[PDB]
From a paper:
NMR and X-ray crystallography reveal that Leishmania has a unique type of N-terminally-extended cap-binding protein (eIF4E4) that binds via a PAM2 motif to PABP1. Exceptionally, therefore, by binding tightly to two protein ligands and to the mRNA 5′ cap4 structure, the trypanosomatid N-terminally extended form of eIF4E acts as the core molecular scaffold for the mRNA-cap-binding complex. Thus, in Leishmania, the chain of interactions 5′cap4-eIF4E4–PABP1-poly(A) bridges the mRNA 5′ and 3′ ends.
In further work, we were able to solve the crystal structures of PABP1(J) and of PABP1(J) co-crystallized with a synthetic eIF4E4 PAM2 peptide, both to a resolution of ∼2 Å. The structure of the complex reveals how the eIF4E4 peptide binds across the three α-helical segments of the 70-residue PABC domain of PABP1 in a similar fashion to other PABC-interacting proteins. The eIF4E4 peptide in the crystal structure assumes an extended conformation, whereby the PAM2 motif wraps around the core KITGMFLE motif of the PABC domain of PABP1. The phenylalanine (F525) in the PABC core motif of Leishmania PABP1 (KITGMFLE) represents a variation on the MLLE motif generally found in other poly(A)-binding proteins; this residue is located on α-helix 3 and forms part of a hydrophobic pocket that interacts with M140 in the eIF4E4 sequence. A144 in eIF4E4 fits into the hydrophobic pocket formed partially by the PABP1 G523 that also sits on α-helix 3. The carbonyl oxygens of both P142 and A144 interact with the Nϵ atom of K520 at the N-terminal end of α-helix 3. It is also noteworthy that the crystal structure indicates that M148 is angled away from (and does not interact with) P519, although our NMR data reveal that the M148 backbone amide undergoes a significant change in its environment upon binding to PABP1.
Residue numbers in the entry:
A (entry chain A): 482 to 559
B (entry chain C): 482 to 558
C (entry chain B), D (entry chain D): 138 to 149
The structure:
Amino acid sequence: LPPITPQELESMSPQEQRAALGDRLFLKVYEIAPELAPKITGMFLEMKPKEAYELLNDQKRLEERVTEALCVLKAHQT
Amino acid sequence: LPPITPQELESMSPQEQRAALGDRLFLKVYEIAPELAPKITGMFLEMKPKEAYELLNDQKRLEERVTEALCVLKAHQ
Amino acid sequence: HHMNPNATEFMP
Amino acid sequence: HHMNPNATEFMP
C-alpha cells in the first residue's frame, strides 16, 4: 500500500478517509501487535483524521501510541 | 482537602487549577502508588483541567488511569 | 480524547 | 490522549 498524499486525503469522503487510513494503520500496528491490531486500529480511528495520518508518517509516535493503546486495554481488564 | 466545585475551578487561573487539582490528585494516587505518586500525578496534570477534575469524582476510573500510567512507565523500561 | 477501550474493531 | 512517561513530577 503506497502512502496517501495530503491532497488525496482532503479529496476523500469521511468514510473513504477512514478505510484508507485504517488499512494503512492496520498494517503498521500488525507488525507490533498482530493479535490486537483490529482493536488498536479501531481505537486510533477515533482520533481526528489529521492525527491518524500523522501516525503513518512518524514511526516513533505510532509505536508510542500502540504502547498507550495496549496500556489502556490492560487497565480496562483491571 | 475539601473538594473543588466546578464553579471554583472555572474561576481559577491555569496555574491555580494545576496546584489545586494536583494536590488532590496526589493524595488519591498516593493511596494506590505512594512511591510513584509524584510521577503519576505529573502525568495526569497534562490532561485538560475538566478531564483531570473528572478523575477526582470517579474513583473507579481514577484507579484505572493509575494502572494505565504504571503500564506506560513499565513499558518505558 | 483519552483512547477508548470499547472502540469498534477495524477489519481491513 | 496523554500518558507521557517523561512528564514532570508533581510535588505538593
